[PDB]
DNA sequence: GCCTATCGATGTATATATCTGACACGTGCCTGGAGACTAGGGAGTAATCCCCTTGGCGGTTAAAACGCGGGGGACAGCGCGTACGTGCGTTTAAGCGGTGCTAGAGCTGTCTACGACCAATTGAGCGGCCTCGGCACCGGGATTCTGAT
DNA sequence: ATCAGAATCCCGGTGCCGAGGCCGCTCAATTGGTCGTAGACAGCTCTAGCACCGCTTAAACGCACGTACGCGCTGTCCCCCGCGTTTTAACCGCCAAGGGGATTACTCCCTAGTCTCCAGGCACGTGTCAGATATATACATCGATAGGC
């Protein structure tokens, strides 16, 4: 019978990271899940558009990084950017 | 009739008269000034008063010479009604109604910017001829000047120079073709590049190339006319930079520090490093704010370039030797620095610059002449042409040029229609600098040119 | 897992899968999904901070849409990011213009 | 049945919209504006319904319509 | 006694700004939606959720435009909103035809 | 002597500038300002010529639109003179922040 | 004296009459001069946002010239569209 | 170097509605960018429609409804009729 | 005729459109009907636009269409104005407009 | 205090003149389009399950509606004098024609590091049923107010 | 002025259950090796972009003046708010069909990709005349004065 995936457990665990004592509501989780999708939707559109404008078959980290700096104001962008490169560093240094 | 002055005149006139009796334009490439004007005006009265061709003549010459050009007309040819089209748009408008609607002239005297704007009259009203000298804009086939002038209504025209070919063969076939393009258009279409294989036939048949030209161009050399045979000696001053500009030199090659932000050599643009390196060796205070205190006048100016460190003593020494000088600068701001040095010394100078009006230029000639003014401060492009600046015993190129033809033109402000003293010419070089490199590349252009291009009456 | 290999809580493989299906390009290099996942996890946390604070301010532990809206309308870049965006039951910032107020 | 949008409902909304005082002419204008807005939304949602061969509208058609009309609402759908 | 004019209006604003709940009677709104939709197509069925989503979006959409009208009146140095204010604001949004 | 009444010539100007379509800022200043701002983002960067003209089109067009909104704002205030707050209101009601 | 020259900031090089000329094209009849500086500020914010994204396109392309398409993509990504400069 | 454009097609269409007229390169440039934009708008929506309806394949039905989702009604109705006429006579070939 | 556009009786390049769609990534697959339908729509739109611009040009005594004429047409047709609301035309200018308050009396 | 003139002021429209560069047009050239071809599974059909929206029932209450006083804001009109539209003369530097340089955009060819691909493997995370105490929401308080003196 | 009292919070109590957890499982993410391509690298080309000068001037700037507009001020009045009133049907909890959705098995047509052939489309060069532009009208409309009456 029917099945559907979510982001919910990740958000939930991230909540427990920031505020282990703190709870949430399904309504809020629904809002968060939609929000997560919309951000992904926005980034991917740019990443596609960038690759096309750069005659590129292949999206990679550059497209995400620059798309983020296009989509986000402020140090919020650069925090995210640095986490991205950091996470990519961990990934690339990991095996 | 006009005057008899110099031996080469009548031979040149008879050559020119023959050329136009051959019913073609032609080129006279003799040395600078030499009264080619005079021989041309003799040709005009040969028309007006031996052929009785009083068809109205037109002349284009540079803004710097117009008044002296009138003077050359006034000296010997007031027998020709010569009228000048000049001044504010109103003045230009009136002269149309007053003269162009009236034909009350033998000669029309004009300059390039005006004649371009007012070309309609020069299309619409038939001249006997145009004549142009200093015509080196015609090196460039993209010049609207040539494109328009080649459309203007003339029977024939005379092309004059004493500084032919500033860089390359395209300039020659341009100059060549634009006089008689009805034949030579295929040349500028590039067939001549084939006919003489881009000059690569070179010394092995340079006679052949010049055989293409000697039927059509006359050139006679000043050293060949000899006559006054003054001295012209060139010397070159390889001297080092001062430590301040040396640091700026490193920074321009590398990085500016925030000290050079307070002096603001950063927060400024960088997309012509050559220009900045040149300024750096020339004088760092050419950069705004690089003068460490704008209120001062002092030795810091004189020291902040190794040139001025020498040139102060040199100027004082030369002036003390009674040697007066023309200083030619690549950039007006260095003339300002030189004038700041004059003001700092209280040394007395004349200046001509593109902002200076031709009447002001003319009086500046009478002011650097006639009295012991230490120096004439001259913009190379505006000031290099024509003048009889014999009052200076010397010339110094404070900053090196990119075409030695400019140096020749500037230096040939001596000796034209005579000079009667020893003249020394001095070239300043930043020792171990780009100025050496520019010098070497400039010398390469020289070496590329005369070794073939010298043909003419030389052949 | 790739997620664990990145040290991320967000599902790198799922992100990669979504990129595959999303046709955003012919091809994707391995760094892209890694970097993108980190971005999403980071932005998720940053929001959840203010949401928890608003809940704490509201003396609640179950984060609720009111808190989310208030948070977004109190972080300008997020309010800008979500300027075209609205939140169910979120309401508005309580504020009134001085012209309206009693003396 | 547009009057089913009650005057006091409009006033309640305007109070959340920080309006201190309302001239009655506002109410009919409000109903007008809202009707045009709703219709344009309804249009696209039905279109997605038709295109999906559905007889039944979904909030997905709504959120898609909103997304096409320069709006988005997190919380419904997904 | 009476409360003075516009005094309790502010408590009402504070209330409705502090609270976050829906402001419109569902059945009237649903009826309006349905009997509009019937002119797009016959017998359109609806997700129950869709009605609420529409109502939320509608209320939100008005709320912002209302506040824009408030500023417009305020800029006109008036405290009573008037239809001209809405028409200006909608057109300054560029969202009016 | 003679003088035109206030605004009379501006009306001819307005009509003239509604018929004509050329760019209105002096290009050379506009280029300089852009290149300064560019340096403020990126110490050194070149420009294609056409890019500058594209910017000036967008800039003047964007400005002209904002003028109309401010004009209507002042008119809505029953003022013929425009003042900066009308622009701020316009931007606010344009939703441009 | 001549040793240096001081020059007005190109922001003010957006001349008073140029603003009026543009404002007149916007149908502005009558202007209080504060409009002028206010407009410059508005334009500066407007230009700044576009330029930053444009340069960002340029850098992702690793170009040294700003490319006109970078402006087009900047404008369009910022939700404004302008034909006649390619597309 | 070589690049495509719509220009010849626009040109011929112009000679339909206004034979004995011409067009500036500026206008033709403008027209091309405009055609580019319209193409982008429809195709992105067709993607979403197919994605929402799970289709791997863009189809004419997506095109029709996408245009309906973009044009004011009469333009859409005309456009739909024209696309219908073209497609039907094409497939009848 | 080999030309598919000719079999479609269109002007617009079915083949190029089909290629563009194939390369457009808008979905994994494209059905043979989709290109034809879009091409006809674009051709129709272009004509409907160019006709009004051509009229405006002719009314301005000019045989050649220029950006002003496009802008006028696009802004005179309010449906084009809405469709191109988020769009600007270089050197297009604007429609004439004076708000009556500004007129002298 | 008009309201009609009046000259006439200075305007832009509309006149016919010659003029050019941009544009319709023809060229050789060629790659993307068209004419074939197959492969296979995406999309379609009929199929059943059951959920959901539908329409419906009831009673209770809150919301809507309506009647009212009025005072407060909306509004009109008035005098005040600011600052800004205008026409002036003066200056600047915008615009333009050059001059000259080369950095880097754009192309080229080479390759091989990278990712797409397919197979099998495993538990990740999903859904179903579970219990709980943070949530509402309750009654009844105390607080903290306006607003009349 | 202050005190009244109206209606706002704060509090403990009742209690409900959506939230939070655990289990069964499956399928997609992981691990693993292969194919071959993109696109990264390196190189060469020459454009168009950068820089200063020489020169014209349309333009900006600044000046002085008067206008009417923006503005603060006034009073008028009426339509709003706050309110008790009666009336209404939204509400909510309830019921129960059965339409429509969501479901799967079998299926062919359709498109992806194949290669072959080759001209529609293009880059390029062409001629030429539409809009360009000269400057001349015409007669506008805009004006003032300030007509008369």
Author numbering:
A (entry chain D): 28 to 122
B (entry chain K): 42 to 500
C (entry chain C): 16 to 118
D (entry chain F): 25 to 102
E (entry chain E): 39 to 135
F (entry chain A): 38 to 134
G (entry chain B): 16 to 102
H (entry chain H): 29 to 121
What does the paper say about this structure?
The chromatin remodeler ALC1 is recruited to and activated by DNA damage-induced poly(ADP-ribose) (PAR) chains deposited by PARP1/PARP2/HPF1 upon detection of DNA lesions. ALC1 uses its macro domain to bind to PAR produced by PARP1 and PARP2. In the absence of DNA damage, the macro domain of ALC1 is abutted against its ATPase, which stabilizes an inactive conformation. PAR binding to the macro domain relieves this auto-inhibition upon recruitment to DNA damage.
Despite a high level of conformational heterogeneity in our dataset, we could isolate a set of 5487 particles that yielded a map of the ATPase domain of ALC1 bound to the nucleosome with a global resolution of 4.8 Å. Nevertheless, this resolution is sufficient for the map to display clear secondary structure elements, allowing model building. The map also shows a clear interaction of the C-terminal ATPase lobe with the N-terminal tail of histone H4. The ATPase motor of ALC1 aligns optimally with the ADP-BeF3-bound conformations of Snf2 and Isw1, compared to their conformations in the presence of ADP or in the absence of any ligand (for Snf2), consistent with our use of this ligand to induce the active conformation of the motor. The ATPase motor of ALC1 is otherwise most similar to that of its closest homologue CHD4. Notably, our map does not show density for either the macro domain of ALC1 or PAR chains on the nucleosome, most likely due to their extreme conformational flexibility in the active state.
